[PDB]
Design a protein around this ligand. Structure first.
Ligand code: HEM
Length: 154
């Protein structure tokens, strides 16, 4: 698939707003993911013991991981589809070390969309959401293909 420059513009415009508060958006997205799909929290050995949203908001480790996650995603989106080099180490660790199924990448995409819709309504109208969804589908398609080459493809 290929996004048009106009679609990338819509994606990078709202992303510029997300970058004004990287740690806060990282926390919001992880919490949304963990509340909606509790099974995903089991993948994080460091903090899978957290029981409530209050504990999640208070976790320094969760916040740190949120920033690491968002910074990596931001670097990929800024490549505008030319993310082959960035995808390699990411695909290898999530398939072989962490064992993250493609379905979990769909769940986090949903959480990213929920959070941007709540925090940035004016810059996240129907067209902008369509463009963000297209960018995330592209990322998922490419990483799934990479998983397959690596021997995981789940
Ligand atoms: C847009 C998708 C994602 C991006 C860009 C991303 C990015 C990262 C980055 C950069 C790291 C640290 C380096 C590494 O281990 O590769 C990481 C670690 C990890 N990620 Fe992700 N990730 C994504 C999705 C997920 C999802 C959906 C899950 C789980 C349900 C997950 C679970 C983990 C785990 C368990 C680690 C290890 C954390 C630790 O070191 O304690 N990732 N991810």
């Amino acid at each position: 698939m290929v996004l048009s420059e106009g679609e990338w513009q819509l994606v990078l415009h709202v992303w510029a707003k997300v970058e004004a508060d990287v740690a806060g958006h990282g926390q919001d997205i992880f919490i949304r993911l963990f509340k909606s799909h509790p099974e995903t929290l089991e993948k994080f050995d460091r903090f899978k013991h957290l029981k409530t949203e209050a504990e999640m908001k208070a976790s320094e480790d969760l916040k740190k991981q949120g920033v690491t996650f968002l910074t990596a995603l931001g670097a990929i989106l800024k490549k505008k589809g030319h993310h082959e080099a960035e995808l390699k180490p990411l695909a290898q660790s999530h398939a072989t070390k962490h064992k993250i199924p493609i379905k979990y990448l769909e769940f986090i995409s949903e959480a990213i969309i929920h959070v941007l819709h709540s925090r940035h309504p004016g810059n996240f109208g129907a067209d902008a959401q369509g463009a963000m969804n297209k960018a995330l589908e592209l990322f998922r398609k490419d990483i799934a293909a990479k998983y397959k080459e690596l021997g995981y493809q789940g």
